[PDB]
């Protein structure tokens, strides 16, 4: 018998569960007392897919709202201690995540190299210094990659910037947040913004990547795109809306607006914030891609990823300029994005990746973004009928997430998805399919998980359905639990907190950093109905083991925004 | 009862203990060491009573010596029905588990953003000139000011700050050079951090040759208030005495710049990825210029105009490194002059033979909350260059006497935790031995936990392994170094690991004000009682919420991490020492 909990703890007013894996009822013990304060029943749950973890029971101790330290006991099996606190993850983890970013800033010989990096295929060198190393084992810097697969592009460095700026605005009205924390957060954000400036060519487009073929050599760093697990470079480095650039424009436009917030006047300053420079870059990049986008896409065709990224761009540009043309632009993108919601024989209201819905949208970094982008758009849409129609597509999208998550036995509340392999049919699953358009790529989904936590909390201020809001709060707390150690490996994936933190290749000097988040758990390597983390047969194989333990900056950025949204909503019952 | 252990664990070879806190009245007489994986006891051990400690009032304690355990794995201690937490026995343990995190800690504390923007044009106190002193690291988890040193008005308390970080990193980089199991990417990270620091040292040098003592904001976190200055007292009154004498960081800064200039001698330097060349000549010329300028001016920069032990250990480092980097006889003559001065600081009185004196007649003993291992470490550096047989033997006699003194004073009284003791004197008190520095001292306010001091004495105990010729002393120094290491990592009466991110009960500083401790960093730590100097305290109830006092315990400060990083690197070098 093992009692699994969130290794850190539970938000004071959140949904609260533990999972017993055993082949009784449960006590909740006050640590300070040593004595039982609740006695609760075990709800039986079936076996999960082919995870082969035995039967499980959940214990629901949501009603506990007393701040303290507690333990769960069943029989003579005790969980580890965990904490219940208001603002628990804000209080215990938010600072560490900023230090993680500052520790990952491109610096020393790499920063020196990146002042004079060549454009692939040419001898022209450009100054693209700044930003962050992408991963605990990769000093390359990315807008996105996997572009040659079309449907898999993750938003990388730009997403970190937009997430931090958006977190900063959310915290603006929080009295218990200190101005020094604002100084640190906006610094990391504008540091990122400054790199997004340097990644823009005079023509207006942004570079996709500064890539060294994973060599760690300064001489191999080049502005390029790249494809396959062999990292073959190409000259197709102009970033289309889905290849990072839409989110970069969105982040730049948000950055230009900081002087709208009272804290920006109050905190210490030096120089002035280059506000107009950010805004002009965002506008220029935007009108450039409305001219050039399709020519930058590998298959020449826009898909749901373009549409949510361009929606964020045009929305932020509208908030930052109040120019009617950007509201028209946002309406245009929102209409397209809403039309990706489609129904078939398996699901009502799933998200389509392509035009006919034959390829469902699923995304290991950012599955919450279609709904997130719609919520952002809802903050600006004053047309009552457009707002109403959008609310309903947004409600169906939230319902679809809950519904597919609950379709099958799922004691952990792992957010399920609708996927398709290249030689396979559409099907619901826990984890992304391994046979996809990249021909190799799949890994833990912590960023995707945190993007869905972010969507669930954002919905609290957006929708009207109190029942759905309720189920979202619960969904959000269990996805949070998974990342923080309530999973079958009893493993906290936020480094420096909880137990069993995994490492990457510290024997080779590629160690995971405190405050960072790793890729995480996948299906099995041979059995895609299985579950795995550093499975025995691949654990020592360097061509494969990065799928599990390596850290990657989008995980940390989406976790940062997730916990900031949790903090906003921490008292909404 | 409670079983206290190193929260992380024990280096595979050498001294290992746990401490039991239990009633005087304990019927039990043995401990078992349990293998976590199987639950089998693999060793059974006697309990040795240690007796009460000073006026700590922690009750009775017993030590459990499981040094004989060499077998890698996870274990716990059991006494009766009481068990300790689990811990690891591993070769290279702290290197494997903490080194990378301490480097990420430094990179996380680099001066950046608006503070970097301010420091490119910071005013010099009392003038209308401004200077570009950007770079380096924030001094503390609650202080974005940057320091060579401070407490200069107290004369005997100056701690080596930013410069010590750079010398410690460079010294660690060199020790690691012939370690096959350290990866080159680690070397890239460590030399980056060290040269980042050395670059800041260069910007801190005035064209005349002296270094600025401090870039200080009166603790305000205001960009405009930053200013090159000295300051004094707890109110931070600024002044124009910002020329750093040898003891005010400048001697260690010269040592660091001279060590930096030599990195091209190391095979790794050519091997790792390049982006142009390290500024070797620039560092060496600055070190020489700074050195000769203080040979002329030092006395004028000192608050009482008189050098003391701290000038002599810092200037011994400076001259030893300049000799190493130049091979010029000139610098070996300097180093010999400084060593002769430092050795003459060892004195005896009715309490202690061969204590260290801070002033000329030994009426004020040397004690130092950041760096008490430095007199012996400087002498060890010098022994590395001294070719003359009689000079070496005489210096070895003084060193062995100093190592014996630290072991004697630590073992003078009941001391289950092996806390390194020291010989102190309050401004209106007599010389006496103690655990913790005296609260009534020349500063009129300053005292705090001693982690950097603890790690400098760990560093001294491991450097001795390669320097001295006495096996029995080398052996008691290994034991001492291990217990010092335990204290920092949670084998203490607070059951508190003070390396943030590792172990349990990590303390914070003022996170509700946005001043959060950083993972990989080390806090000040434990002190005597606030009212009772014979007691022990860490965030005591009466002062825990008082901001004029609570910085003494939980705040992080960069000397602690930097001395911790060197201490574990010297342990790693000596890990196979049979
Ligand atoms: Na492209
Ligand atoms: Na001075």
TrEMBL record, chain A:
Residues 93-504 form the Glycoside hydrolase family domain. InterPro entries: 6-hairpin_glycosidase_sf, 6hp_glycosidase-like_sf, Cellulase_Ig-like, Glyco_hydro_9, Ig-like_fold, Ig_E-set. One of its GO terms (biological process) is polysaccharide catabolic process. Keywords: Carbohydrate metabolism, Glycosidase, Hydrolase, Polysaccharide degradation. GO terms for molecular function: cellulase activity. It comes from the Bacteria. PANTHER family: ENDO-1,4-BETA-GLUCANASE (PTHR22298). Belongs to the glycosyl hydrolase 9 (cellulase E) family. This is Endoglucanase-related protein. It comes from Photobacterium profundum (strain SS9).
